[PDB]
Amino acid sequence: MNIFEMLRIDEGLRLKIYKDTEGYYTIGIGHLLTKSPSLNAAKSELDKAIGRNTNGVITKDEAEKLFNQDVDAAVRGILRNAKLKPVYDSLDAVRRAALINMVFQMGETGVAGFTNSLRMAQQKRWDEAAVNAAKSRWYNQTPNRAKRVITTFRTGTWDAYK
């Protein structure tokens, strides 16, 4: 299992623009398009990402690309977020993926807001940090997802995804 396999599981796959759980225009594998309510903005934006007039629809390949770019940026973000770099680096490989999923889902920012857990996570306090993570708007809004992730983080295995 890996980062791509993992997020493919958590975000699914849609070839047509859709709204997330948040009500936001999205497509592909978790490719947020715009916080705006304008479906039009949203198609502009798809078109712009894609490089053509999609008319609101992309191919598998197209989704796979946005996805590739999206994971890449995530890792690159992490690695450049000075609060984030050092946690990430301290982690084993499973756990890294967990940090990247989270970042892919809520942004460097939002993630940067798990300071408290992020520090116990830094300090190898698996369970302690996992319980703190649960006390978050993030956990309450997408419990099931959130769970697979605080599990993977805490355990350092992929069990939650098997």
DSSP-derived secondary structure letter, 125: -
In DSSP terms, 155 is beta-bridged to: none
If the CB atoms of residues 56 and 83 are measured against Cl ion, the closer one turns out to be 56
C-alpha to C-alpha distances, 97 to 38, 77, 105, 139, nearest whole angstrom: 33, 13, 12, 18
Dihedral sign, Cα of residue 29, residue 33, residue 36, residue 41:
negative
- The 77-116 contact track toward ligand XE, x by CB under 6 A, reads -------------------------------------x--
Q: Select the span of 19-27, 62-70, 71-79, 122-130 touching ligand XE (CB under 6 A).
A: 122-130
Residues 6+ apart with CB under 8 A from 85: 78, 79
Please, what is the minimum distance in Å from the beta carbon of residue 141 to Cl ion?
Answer: 8
- Report, as residue numbers or ranges, the catalytic residues: 11, 20
74 near ligand XE, rule: CB under 6 A: no
Q: Which residues are annotated as a binding site for substrate?
A: 32, 104, 117, 132
Q: Which residues are annotated as a binding site?
A: 32, 104, 117, 132
